[PDB]
Design a protein around this motif. Sequence first.
Motif, mmCIF file in Angstrom:
data_model
loop_
_atom_site.group_PDB
_atom_site.id
_atom_site.type_symbol
_atom_site.label_atom_id
_atom_site.label_comp_id
_atom_site.label_asym_id
_atom_site.label_seq_id
_atom_site.Cartn_x
_atom_site.Cartn_y
_atom_site.Cartn_z
ATOM 1 N N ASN A 170 -35.945 -33.231 -22.352
ATOM 2 C CA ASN A 170 -35.570 -31.882 -21.952
ATOM 3 C C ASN A 170 -35.559 -31.800 -20.423
ATOM 4 N N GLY A 171 -34.561 -31.101 -19.887
ATOM 5 C CA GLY A 171 -34.326 -30.912 -18.458
ATOM 6 C C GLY A 171 -33.937 -32.155 -17.648
ATOM 7 N N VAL A 172 -33.527 -33.224 -18.315
ATOM 8 C CA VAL A 172 -33.271 -34.500 -17.643
ATOM 9 C C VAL A 172 -32.179 -34.400 -16.564
ATOM 10 N N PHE A 173 -31.214 -33.495 -16.750
ATOM 11 C CA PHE A 173 -30.109 -33.396 -15.774
ATOM 12 C C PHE A 173 -30.274 -32.212 -14.898
ATOM 13 N N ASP A 174 -31.370 -31.469 -15.060
ATOM 14 C CA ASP A 174 -31.475 -30.159 -14.426
ATOM 15 C C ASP A 174 -31.374 -30.100 -12.904
ATOM 16 N N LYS A 175 -31.764 -31.157 -12.192
ATOM 17 C CA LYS A 175 -31.726 -31.128 -10.709
ATOM 18 C C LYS A 175 -30.418 -31.634 -10.165
ATOM 19 N N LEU A 176 -29.585 -32.130 -11.065
ATOM 20 C CA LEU A 176 -28.342 -32.723 -10.647
ATOM 21 C C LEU A 176 -27.207 -31.727 -10.451
ATOM 22 N N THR A 177 -27.441 -30.751 -9.576
ATOM 23 C CA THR A 177 -26.533 -29.622 -9.410
ATOM 24 C C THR A 177 -25.191 -29.992 -8.765
ATOM 25 N N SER A 178 -25.053 -31.170 -8.128
ATOM 26 C CA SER A 178 -23.756 -31.524 -7.530
ATOM 27 C C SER A 178 -22.956 -32.467 -8.428
ATOM 28 N N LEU A 179 -23.503 -32.761 -9.604
ATOM 29 C CA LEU A 179 -22.894 -33.704 -10.535
ATOM 30 C C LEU A 179 -21.527 -33.219 -11.002
ATOM 31 N N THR A 180 -20.541 -34.112 -10.887
ATOM 32 C CA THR A 180 -19.167 -33.859 -11.288
ATOM 33 C C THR A 180 -18.688 -34.685 -12.474
ATOM 34 N N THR A 181 -19.378 -35.779 -12.704
ATOM 35 C CA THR A 181 -18.986 -36.733 -13.734
ATOM 36 C C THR A 181 -20.211 -37.299 -14.474
ATOM 37 N N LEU A 182 -20.193 -37.216 -15.805
ATOM 38 C CA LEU A 182 -21.325 -37.660 -16.629
ATOM 39 C C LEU A 182 -20.873 -38.483 -17.839
ATOM 40 N N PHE A 183 -21.283 -39.747 -17.911
ATOM 41 C CA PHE A 183 -20.836 -40.666 -18.960
ATOM 42 C C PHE A 183 -21.966 -41.034 -19.909
ATOM 43 N N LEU A 184 -21.865 -40.631 -21.190
ATOM 44 C CA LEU A 184 -22.955 -40.896 -22.145
ATOM 45 C C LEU A 184 -22.451 -41.611 -23.388
ATOM 46 N N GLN A 185 -21.233 -42.115 -23.310
ATOM 47 C CA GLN A 185 -20.577 -42.598 -24.512
ATOM 48 C C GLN A 185 -21.163 -43.906 -25.063
ATOM 49 N N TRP A 186 -21.122 -44.025 -26.391
ATOM 50 C CA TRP A 186 -21.527 -45.241 -27.075
ATOM 51 C C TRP A 186 -22.991 -45.557 -26.800
ATOM 52 N N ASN A 187 -23.766 -44.488 -26.657
ATOM 53 C CA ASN A 187 -25.168 -44.546 -26.992
ATOM 54 C C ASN A 187 -25.304 -44.308 -28.521
ATOM 55 N N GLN A 188 -26.484 -43.894 -28.967
ATOM 56 C CA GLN A 188 -26.795 -43.580 -30.353
ATOM 57 C C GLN A 188 -27.378 -42.185 -30.441
ATOM 58 N N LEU A 189 -26.907 -41.230 -29.650
ATOM 59 C CA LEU A 189 -27.535 -39.929 -29.630
ATOM 60 C C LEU A 189 -27.403 -39.193 -30.965
ATOM 61 N N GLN A 190 -28.565 -38.703 -31.381
ATOM 62 C CA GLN A 190 -28.781 -37.975 -32.631
ATOM 63 C C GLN A 190 -28.933 -36.504 -32.358
ATOM 64 N N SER A 191 -29.238 -36.182 -31.108
ATOM 65 C CA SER A 191 -29.379 -34.797 -30.702
ATOM 66 C C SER A 191 -29.095 -34.615 -29.219
ATOM 67 N N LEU A 192 -28.865 -33.391 -28.791
ATOM 68 C CA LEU A 192 -28.814 -33.030 -27.393
ATOM 69 C C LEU A 192 -29.870 -31.946 -27.192
ATOM 70 N N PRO A 193 -30.683 -32.059 -26.130
ATOM 71 C CA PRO A 193 -31.654 -30.979 -25.911
ATOM 72 C C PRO A 193 -31.016 -29.610 -25.705
ATOM 73 N N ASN A 194 -31.634 -28.525 -26.188
ATOM 74 C CA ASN A 194 -31.095 -27.221 -25.847
ATOM 75 C C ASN A 194 -31.060 -27.082 -24.309
#
Length: 330
Positions: free
Chosen positions: A191-215
């Motif tokens: 939870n909150g893993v991306f929260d400080k990344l306020t200038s982030l424009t591009t995020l790649f998470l593909q072909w992991n095994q994610l079963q959930s995304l945090p609220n």
Amino acid sequence: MACPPKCRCEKLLFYCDSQGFHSVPNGLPSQLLGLSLRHNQLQSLPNGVFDKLTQLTWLHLDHNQLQSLPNGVFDKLTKLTELILSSNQLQSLPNGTFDKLTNLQNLDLSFNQLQSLPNGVFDKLTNLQTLHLRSNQLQSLPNGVFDKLTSLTFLDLSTNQLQSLPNGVFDKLTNLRELHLEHNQLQSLPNGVFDKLTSLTTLFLQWNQLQSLPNGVFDKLTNLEKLDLTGNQLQSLPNGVFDKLTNLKILLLDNNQLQSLPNGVFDKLKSLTTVGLSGNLWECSPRVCALASWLGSFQGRWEHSILCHSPDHTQGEDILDAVHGFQLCW
């Protein structure tokens, strides 16, 4: 100015690459500004071999067969701005190996065999902009390992063996623009893993095994422009998961295990121009009508066909066709 045999020298830049060398040529001049030794053989470097090269701003050692790095070998290259070590056979990094490279801006360790990173290995690189760790063997990341990299704008951790991310691991990377986490083994996110990344424009998470995304996981990424979640194991999305992504232009959800989407899940994506919803397990019943309607008036594009998975008598059919052919909506 003496140029080593088979090398190509342009003033204070020496290109000793692509010559099948087994060792660093003697005796390079103390005023070298750049040195390339890429595409040689080379399994090892002698202790202190670069010590006299105090003015070097860039060093290329990519595509050799380096099995290890001597202790202190980069010490003294205090002016180095770029270090390229990609495409070698490094299994470990010596402790403090980059500690004297305080002006380093670009570090490329891609395509090696690193199984771990020493604690604090990047701690002195306060000016680093780009860090490439792609296609290595990392199973975990030390806590705080990126904490000093306040100038970092690009981070590539793709194609490792990462099974989890430590809490807060990106919290100091406030200037981060691009983050590659694809092709690891993540099954959940803190939870909150991306929260400080306020200038982030591009995020790649593909072909992991994610079963959930945090609220709320994408809630702070108000500048995000592209999000790739392709090929994970999502069976559902939490409500409002994309609500804050008002500048998002590309959203890829192909090849998950989605049967359905929450009503209004895309409603706030004013800037969206590409969506991806191929694969998945779409149920073509009145459950799809909200999606079918959004698709029908979308406004942007999708690159691969969106198909019914169930029920059996609709399997294979384009969603938009099935809705009419089997009168499922309207």
